[PDB]
Amino acid sequence: GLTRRKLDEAIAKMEEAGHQFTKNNANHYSISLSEAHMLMDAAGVPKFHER
Amino acid sequence: KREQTIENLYQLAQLTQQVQADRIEIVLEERRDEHFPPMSKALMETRSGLTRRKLDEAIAKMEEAGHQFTKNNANHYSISLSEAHMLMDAAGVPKFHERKKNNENKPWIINVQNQKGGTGKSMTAVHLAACLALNLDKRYRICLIDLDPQGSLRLFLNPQISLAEHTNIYSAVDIMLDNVPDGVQVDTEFLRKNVMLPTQYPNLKTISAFPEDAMFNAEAWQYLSQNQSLDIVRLLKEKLIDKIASDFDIIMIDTGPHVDPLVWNAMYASNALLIPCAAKRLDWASTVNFFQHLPTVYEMFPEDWKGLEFVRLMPTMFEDDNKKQVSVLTEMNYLLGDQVMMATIPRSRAFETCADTYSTVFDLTVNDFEGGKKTLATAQDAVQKSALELERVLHSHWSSLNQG
Amino acid sequence: KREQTIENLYQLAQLTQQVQADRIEIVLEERRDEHFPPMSKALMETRSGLTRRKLDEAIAKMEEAGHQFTKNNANHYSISLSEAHMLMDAAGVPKFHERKKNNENKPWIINVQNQKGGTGKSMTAVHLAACLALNLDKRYRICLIDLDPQGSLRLFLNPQISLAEHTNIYSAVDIMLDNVPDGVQVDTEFLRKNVMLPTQYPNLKTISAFPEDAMFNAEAWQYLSQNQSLDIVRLLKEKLIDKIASDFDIIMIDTGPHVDPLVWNAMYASNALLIPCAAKRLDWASTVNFFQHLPTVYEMFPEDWKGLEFVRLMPTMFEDDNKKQVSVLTEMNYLLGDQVMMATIPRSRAFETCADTYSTVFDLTVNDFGKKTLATAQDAVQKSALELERVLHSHWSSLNQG
Amino acid sequence: DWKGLEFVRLMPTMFEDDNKKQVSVLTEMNYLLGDQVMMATIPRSRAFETCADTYSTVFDLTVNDFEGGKKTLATAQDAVQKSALELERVLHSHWSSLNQG
Ligand SMILES: Nc1ncnc2c1ncn2[C@@H]1O[C@H](COP(=O)(O)OP(=O)(O)OP(O)(O)=S)[C@@H](O)[C@H]1O
Ligand SMILES: Nc1ncnc2c1ncn2[C@@H]1O[C@H](COP(=O)(O)OP(=O)(O)OP(O)(O)=S)[C@@H](O)[C@H]1O
Ligand SMILES: [Mg+2]
Ligand SMILES: [Mg+2]
């Protein structure tokens, strides 16, 4: 449920760190499930409890 | 000065005489050339619910009778919808207007009103009504009202069939005024004659509407000029509701995207409340305005009416996979839970195809269109489980709202 | 025994004014903190139609003043939208009105009207108007009227950037209702300082709409009871149109989906009608019903308007590949050709983003994020704007002469 | 003996659709002989060049033949076909007039 602009904001906040968004056989960003968790953990979306 | 705009107003004319043409060709083009879907000994099982043994017994009892059964190109049995309702008529299975448990009941008035344009009330509600009519085990006598002067419910393949033989008619307007021949009194026989019409189903019925119905609002402003007690509210109640409550059990009512004197009467006189809506923000904001506007207005209506017994909201055009709209649905379930239906009405190209040929989902089968099967399958199954859950609200309230 | 019913309705209303406040908070979080994406100095040549030498002349005349052409992350001149407006305001290019040849103009008074709803009134009008805004070579001034009681253009990237110098932002109905301090009168000065607000487009303003507008239907019903002269129609025109045409070149009246006293008032007031009717067969049936109803109603009206000027039915949410709907376009073209627009507003997810995010097609750029999808989105929208505004000349020459 | 031609219209061509001068010219034409000039636009793209070089008209070749100048050719053929039906609709409305002269 993250709009494209929100997801680009999240990856602009995240990617400059040491993390690399692992790509599959192609360049397509193959964000692992844990990668997605971390991304939206620090993306700024409050959890169902922390909100 | 207004030489060229005599030209221009009578050229809005010299174009709407060509649109008078256009409607002539529309009538010539919609004309039926179709057959109703057959039950294929498994669709029969799913829809009617009759066991194969009892079905065999009844179709044999009728086979030795005058009527003869019919079969498809293959010897496999195939029975039409007309034959279906005939076997139901002769099944001996009583209706809610014939059941010893409850036969002397009043109409179950069901309405669909939204203040938002083009989002689905017409198509979704006509689909819901034609699906509830699929309750062939019970033979509901259903009155479809296209109170929206521009709805297609008088034209959309469950229609007010105004054949060429149809001589003259007196819409709900003329029932609000008794503008029929002054000599004759409007009795229920008159109502069958020129108000209650079939819908190509021996069970489902309808009323038609016309753009002249817009003149009702002007006449209501005129009556406000000649009246100050807002008594036009009860005009609907006595003219229509008291005359129709004796001999029908359900009345489907579409009202239109608008809130207006006509629609105020529709709101009030009706003894049940349904609220169609989508999952969009602005729609639910309009519903907030609606929930502010009503209470004061109900205070305006006569005190004799002790409020509507139940209030529920609807989905529509619900893509079911958009984050914003599912969040809206969660919020609604968070606020008015148990007063909002869970069932979802999805949007797919199958509905577009249905509309373009005017044919409701039931009128056409897989051979008619592409493999939007499961989409239509789950559409009709959600509409039918939703019909029985709204009718189960009505069941639990057949203690309350029938005694008020 | 309506105690339960009414108190329960108030309980929904009470928990739901909370939802209204929650939406306001969602705005506050979403409030821009940014402005319209700037131009690249090549889109300058493309849309503003100024040759490189002319643009260097303009910036030679301007830049030596206190103004600085703000640069982006790089040295590339990131001329803000307002910066571009000012640049070409004083560059020496005469506006579409100030240009000597055309200064006795009858402004366009456009309508998007369909008594059947869900056909795309507000979004078609706002996409069209916003694209018209970005014709800089002659710096079109545009005007958009949200006259729908449930309308949502207020925060729609023509948003509530409301200079508090205005006494209050009164909605179009509240101009009709006169919910104003009685001291001030309806004058262009009052409108300028108290009514309309900027919309990120110096070429555009809006006349607002709040939920309580719906009661004006009842109010005008009571008025029609008061008198039957039907003069109520002239209210809109006389009070508002004559005074607001001063500051703008093109006027659009979004009548909304209703057919209510408001919209008879508008129909009579409005003198040019677009009909954004998505051609879908049942939509076209409801609009054939439309085309019975309006001839009678218009026939009923008095003798002080120059009718309408044209109709360009723009099929909204169109696809061009759906066999049935493209066929429906063919019947459009055939049954009623010579009166319909050839191009289309193709259905794209960009438009749904436009709608839900309370945005417009142009105020977000490709960098805002789509990609090719929305790129072709505004490509089609801007070709449609070219075609539309060409029709605008084609009948506007008729407007100046009437 | 010839009572003049029953209808007169102008065409676009090579219309880049994004040049200020040429769109201004089109606006002026629509300003002068409106209803007597087609609205439809014929854009210019490398797809037409490829078509010409192999001699093959847009219909003779498909996406597999060339690059992704798809939508360009798509909107080219669709503008040409809606323009064909609008010129033939001029001819329809004039199948009263010019057939009887
Ligand atoms: N499932 C659907 N598939 C396709 N179109 C749909 C669907 N549901 C609604 N529509 C749209 O709705 C139009 C006609 O149906 P309605 O929405 O009922 O019109 P309406 O009578 O104004 O009802 P409202 O105001 O939208 S609730 C169609 O032309 C579509 O644009
Ligand atoms: N692509 C789309 N994305 C989202 N909403 C759309 C789209 N196309 C049409 N709509 C509908 O249009 C609404 C907003 O635009 P408008 O159609 O102008 O609203 P409006 O003022 O009610 O006029 P109507 O009733 O739709 S003709 C949305 O809330 C939807 O119901
Ligand atoms: Mg409707
Ligand atoms: Mg309008």
Residue numbers in the entry:
A (entry chain B): 52 to 102
B (entry chain C): 4 to 407
C (entry chain D): 4 to 372, 375 to 407
D (entry chain E): 307 to 407
Paper text:
Bacterial cells use several evolutionarily-distinct genome segregation systems, the most common of which is the type I Par system. It consists of an adapter protein, ParB, that binds to the DNA cargo via interaction with the parS DNA sequence; and an ATPase, ParA, that binds nonspecific DNA and mediates cargo transport. Each chromosome encodes its own segregation complex, with Chr1 encoding a chromosomal type Ib system, and Chr2 encoding a plasmid-like type Ia system. In this study, we have reported the structure of the ParA2vc protein, in three states: apo, nucleotide-bound (ADP) and in a filamentous complex with nucleotide and DNA.
